[PDB]
Amino acid sequence: MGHHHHHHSHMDTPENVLQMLEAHMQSYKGNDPLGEWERYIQWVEENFPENKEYLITLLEHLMKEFLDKKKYHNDPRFISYCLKFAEYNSDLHQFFEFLYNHGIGTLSSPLYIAWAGHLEAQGELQHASAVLQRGIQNQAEPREFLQQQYRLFQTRLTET
16 A cells, blocks of 8 residues: 555655565576565665664565465574564464464474563463463474473463
């Protein structure tokens, strides 16, 4: 929502900023597509310091493009960009759940730790524990970080 709306300005719609890589993605041969997107995630952070609306556009469509790219499921950087996206969105239940259902971050501990941290701050301590154990049984690396955060999480909710 903002195509053709570009007025006299140094800045476009977030859509055009994203379309600058998309036009290049159409006929992209095979020099790793993630390496293109990461350049635009850093580019929007250096060119647009408080204009996060552009960054979020790149991030929400990043998880779409590499969603059914099933070899990027557990990529620590791709999941780290989902964690980067997370702090700008209040729908973290729907977000991290969607990732888990599509296999995104099943072998990534920082995914389960991030969601559990959100849920604790809401009062979803039992559901957050239920997320941390999902990591432990799925063997999400680092597994040791899941187990240490699990027991430290349990020693909190038993006292509350």
